[PDB]
Amino acid sequence: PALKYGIVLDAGSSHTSMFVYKWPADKENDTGIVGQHSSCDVQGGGISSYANDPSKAGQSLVRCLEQALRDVPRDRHASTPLYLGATAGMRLLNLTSPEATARVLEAVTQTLTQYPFDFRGARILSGQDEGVFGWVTANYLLENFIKYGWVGRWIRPRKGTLGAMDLGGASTQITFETTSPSEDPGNEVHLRLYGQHYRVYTHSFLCYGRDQILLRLLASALQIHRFHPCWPKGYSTQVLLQEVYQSPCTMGQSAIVSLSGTSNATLCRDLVSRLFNISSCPFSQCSFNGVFQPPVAGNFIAFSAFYYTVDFLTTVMGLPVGTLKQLEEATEITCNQTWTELQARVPGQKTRLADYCAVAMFIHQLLSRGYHFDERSFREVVFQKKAADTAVGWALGYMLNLTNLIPADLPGLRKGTHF
Template sequence: MERAREVIPKSQYQETPVYLGATAGMRLLRIENEGLADNVLTAVTESLSKYSFNFQGARVISGREEGAYGWITINYLLGKFIKKSRWLNLMTNESDSQETYGALDLGGASTQITFVPQNQTVESPRNALYFRLYGKNYNVYTHSFLCYGKDQALLQKLAKDIQETDKILRDPCFNHGYNRVMNISNLQDSPCTKKYKKTLQFHQLQIQGTGNFQQCQQSIFQLFNTSNCPYSHCSFDRIFLPPLQGHFGAFSAYYYVMKFLNLTSEEPYSQEKVIDTVKEFCSRPWEELKRNFSKIHEKYLSEYCFSGTYIISLLQRAYHITPDFWKNIHFMGKIQNSDVGWTLGYMLNLTNKIPAEQPLSAPLSYSTYVFLMVLFSLILVAVVITSLFVFHQPSYFWKDAV
């Protein structure tokens, strides 16, 4: 807010709306303690109301909204909602607007997938969203997997793994030589780990890293129950998922983890390259990582092996992304210097900045404009040729003419 006060002129404070949307962390808190969640929103509202801006309120947005706003952000920044001609950027009335990108969002507590499926068919009503933007209808599929953000997924994996171990867990998702002590209560207090909760004879867990990608991935795969699908296609936990099509922008933790691993070039890396890179990182000794990445907090550094493996596993097992389709996944941090995330889509929706109908088109259609430009060019060429012919005649021509 202090930054906003610096860049926005004082005369526009009252005209500047401020919105606050809370996501999966608050959704989990509401499940665990609704009263505490309400108190947090009340405190935030009181704090933001003290500023001179036009505060519009704070609320917890749903997972469906979070997925939809991320999809809007990507396609708005990529210019997918408006088709422009290549001549003077004239608006056209062409019905074949550009194919939209899908959106893959990975946070700490949840993950979302949102895209327009082939034939715009969504079998499950709870996964269907309808938008009319710039005069075009979009039937969008979206789902938010609460508890499958990278942080909560790690807690789930640890809570699952301690069911068959004593107080020492040799974990392949942490680098060899890594040691960490966790309180069991930190694992069992999350709403996401309740299905693994049981009475244990110890109160602390010692994690010893062994650094093995294949074993780590097999452990992560157990988080996804892919049996008993009631639809034509499913993700996991009996959730409908249409076949993926088109290109996808993967952002938030998808991007930050891949950026750390140097896997975010403009041209997408192959699935094999990504797997080999994560596999090599997981195999590196912990002491070596600490020396090479001394400026990174040890907690975050220690979890990159799990996070990289989890991203690969999520895309492969939950979303059924094949090696051939992997080239359609683009890890995005910014588009045209704007951050990629759900927040821009949230603001665009609340402020009605995206019209339902196509803005007025230019006076001339693209085809008419091209025809007139060609006609004008031909007339211009004819005039030039005529002028050259007339003014380069011999002098006797002019005398005879007189």
């Protein structure tokens, strides 16, 4: 059972992760056959964090690349494809400076070309790419693309697919199979996978990733309140205004200001609600900010910072989140904690602790006000970060596409038996 390997570097907004995948050579076009072999988390910031020192972007990757040499058998290095895909961190940098962006891409390319893997390029994914490849990963891993049944008795309707919601640091994506008519070509996706047609909706909200939303709320709190209602009472920090307003996400919104929390769940809710413009919709139905969206439908997996935040609510706060009402209640309780009370629940390192209130509030509003989940549809949402021992994200679907491992049709069209 000879194995083949593939490597993807997920160059995310706040961090880079390396995934190494493996699959049997002779079974490689089977759905669900590829799985994660290993992974490595790059120390420090995302590659976009090196905009003013691009050489360091390439160097950042070396420790994980050295791991990949150990993870993949030597005799297989040369025929193992290596991809780097960058997402909203690089999309934002590209708005600020196409030149700095190109220099960062040049620096990672120079590093990656020094290694013995079959390097296939460093690219910035589109928002659509990011949404769709995440949806592909989840559904591939869970074997939803199998045609269930047997001759003369196929399951009808076709096996449902799992919608995907991904909360990264700089954008958030929602992607799902839909029967609704397409109203905006930018949201419309058609896939031909194992002989089947999937009509998919996708959208990426740039500036609605976790870190960018936290920056926007901080900017807003500074303007409206001169205290931060989402931060816990007794928490304060020295805010460098240059960092607050340097992002494309906050430009629209005295080197240093002190800012303190107040644990005001209601004012926090009000602050978060200003992130969603529902005033206008040029389509039959919108999510928010005038973006076309059909009604959510089917199961969904919510991963990345959706998962991390919900995991904090359930495991650290010890609160149920099974319903939208429970998620709302858990957010209110979290937001109403003082800084001492919150710290008492977290014996170890406290990074991100002051931010859970704001992120939880955001997620609740995004799902309920933004995407228009209600109790019935929300019941179909699961929070998970892994399937079949493989991290859920866009990297796997990306590798599958570029290595051409998912066929449009089954071999010989399976004699036409699925017609």
